[PDB]
Design a protein around this motif. Structure first.
Motif, PDB file in Angstrom:
ATOM      1  N   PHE A 131     -15.778  -6.786  -5.402  1.00  7.81           N
ATOM      2  CA  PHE A 131     -16.750  -5.839  -4.881  1.00  7.81           C
ATOM      3  C   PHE A 131     -18.086  -6.114  -5.581  1.00  7.81           C
ATOM      4  CE2 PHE A 131     -17.684  -1.500  -3.245  1.00  7.81           C
ATOM      5  CZ  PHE A 131     -18.794  -1.145  -4.019  1.00  7.81           C
ATOM      6  N   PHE A 160      -1.900   5.950   1.032  1.00  9.24           N
ATOM      7  CA  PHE A 160      -3.117   5.205   1.337  1.00  9.24           C
ATOM      8  C   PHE A 160      -2.977   4.333   2.583  1.00  9.24           C
ATOM      9  CE2 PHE A 160      -3.657   5.862  -3.345  1.00  9.24           C
ATOM     10  CZ  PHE A 160      -4.818   6.613  -3.280  1.00  9.24           C
ATOM     11  N   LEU A 173     -17.776 -11.044   5.353  1.00 11.05           N
ATOM     12  CA  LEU A 173     -18.358 -10.739   4.056  1.00 11.05           C
ATOM     13  C   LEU A 173     -19.872 -10.870   4.088  1.00 11.05           C
ATOM     14  CD1 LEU A 173     -15.728 -12.698   1.943  1.00 11.05           C
ATOM     15  CD2 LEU A 173     -16.074 -10.201   1.911  1.00 11.05           C
ATOM     16  N   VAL A 198       0.849  -1.180   0.000  1.00 12.44           N
ATOM     17  CA  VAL A 198       0.000   0.000   0.000  1.00 12.44           C
ATOM     18  C   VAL A 198       0.897   1.247   0.000  1.00 12.44           C
ATOM     19  CG1 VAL A 198      -1.822   1.168   1.287  1.00 12.44           C
ATOM     20  CG2 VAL A 198      -1.732  -1.311   1.214  1.00 12.44           C
ATOM     21  N   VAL A 200      -9.752  -4.173  -6.718  1.00 11.52           N
ATOM     22  CA  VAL A 200     -10.673  -5.205  -6.226  1.00 11.52           C
ATOM     23  C   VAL A 200     -12.108  -4.994  -6.686  1.00 11.52           C
ATOM     24  CG1 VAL A 200      -9.242  -5.614  -4.204  1.00 11.52           C
ATOM     25  CG2 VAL A 200     -11.091  -3.921  -4.085  1.00 11.52           C
ATOM     26  N   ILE A 221     -21.223  -7.754   5.638  1.00  6.99           N
ATOM     27  CA  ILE A 221     -21.106  -6.640   4.696  1.00  6.99           C
ATOM     28  C   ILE A 221     -22.248  -6.747   3.685  1.00  6.99           C
ATOM     29  CG2 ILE A 221     -19.762  -5.740   2.765  1.00  6.99           C
ATOM     30  CD1 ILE A 221     -17.282  -6.439   4.387  1.00  6.99           C
ATOM     31  N   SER A 248     -13.519   3.468  -5.445  1.00 10.96           N
ATOM     32  CA  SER A 248     -12.347   3.243  -4.610  1.00 10.96           C
ATOM     33  C   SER A 248     -11.938   1.777  -4.740  1.00 10.96           C
ATOM     34  CB  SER A 248     -12.645   3.605  -3.160  1.00 10.96           C
ATOM     35  OG  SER A 248     -13.028   4.973  -3.061  1.00 10.96           O
TER      36      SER A 248
END
Ligand SMILES: C/C=C/CC/C=C/CC/C=C/CCCCCCC(=O)OC[C@H](COP(=O)(O)OCCN)OC(=O)CCCCCCC/C=C/C/C=C/CCC
Length: 246
Positions: free
Chosen positions: A133, A40, A89, A36, A129, A92, A123
């Protein structure tokens, strides 16, 4: 409390409970091996910390599932180690249903990582990713909104995800199978009583599990690629978290 039973009612009571934030371990973190970019690092680290808090809560929750603490400790550890990513997940996806455009295949743009925190698709794309997503929002969130999965079914599925007898390495697999079988009976009963007009609902709900498993493996591909997961230390964090102390 009375001899606790593994039931939908009890899982619903447990879903609402908010325990004192147990000391949390670094399951997820931006370390010296993380690619990263400096600019970020603070935000990605913040996201990892949000994740670690949710994982800590999951450990506390698992420990309180009726009969779970009766399982051999090393099996408790394997079950949590094997399901934390799927459970994160799944949560989410559940929270993201409310941000889905009113009921054309335009990809949903917002993912809910926690209340008051959404990740925008742009983003996700920028981080590399975007594919996963989109899978989370289409194979999980959208499907669940279409199926009108309710809170009772959601918590039942969480317990089923945790109590996976197919986790490799279990010492007493039959004890886990029995608990998962108790949940299957509980869930089937609920669907028949609360949604009798919907034949095959129980089977439909279970179809979300193989999808969640596939998405979780892809999640790990990314976590390893960006060196954001404490792979070799996790079993120990769970072991320590279970004997509590946090
Ligand atoms: C399992 C879910 C647990 C909760 C989440 C905790 C995991 C870590 C963070 C996940 C958030 C998704 C990505 C958002 C990144 C935000 C910062 C950003 O834009 O970085 C861009 C940068 C450009 O760099 P650069 O490429 O060098 O420069 C490019 C600038 N154009 O990109 C990076 O620095 C790379 C960031 C890598 C994030 C890893 C994804 C983690 C695994 C996915 C799990 C499934 C969740 C779905 C999320 C969509």
């Amino acid at each position: 409390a009375a001899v606790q039973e593994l039931s939908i009612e009890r899982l619903l009571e447990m879903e609402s409970l908010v325990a004192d934030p147990s000391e949390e371990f670094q399951f997820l973190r931006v370390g010296p091996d993380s690619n990263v970019p400096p600019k970020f690092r603070a935000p990605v680290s913040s996201l990892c910390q949000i994740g670690n808090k949710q994982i800590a809560a999951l450990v506390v929750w698992a420990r309180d599932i009726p009969h779970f603490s009766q399982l051999e400790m090393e099996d408790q550890i394997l079950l949590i180690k094997g399901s934390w990513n799927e459970l994160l997940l799944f949560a989410i996806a559940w929270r993201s249903m409310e941000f889905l455009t009113e009921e054309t295949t335009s990809p949903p743009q917002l993912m809910c990582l926690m209340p008051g925190m959404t990740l925008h698709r742009n983003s996700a794309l920028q981080a590399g990713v975007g594919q996963i997503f989109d899978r989370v929002l289409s194979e999980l969130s959208l499907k669940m909104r279409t199926l009108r999965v309710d809170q009772a079914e959601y918590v039942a599925l969480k317990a089923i995800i945790l109590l996976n007898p197919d986790v490799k390495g279990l010492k007493n697999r039959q004890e886990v199978e029995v608990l998962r079988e108790k949940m299957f009976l509980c869930l089937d009963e609920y669907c028949r009583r609360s949604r009798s007009s919907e034949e095959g609902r129980f089977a439909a709900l279970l179809l979300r599990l193989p999808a969640l498993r596939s998405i979780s493996l892809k999640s790990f591909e990314h976590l390893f690629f960006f060196h954001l997961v404490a792979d070799t230390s996790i079993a120990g964090y769970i072991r320590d978290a279970l004997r509590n102390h946090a």
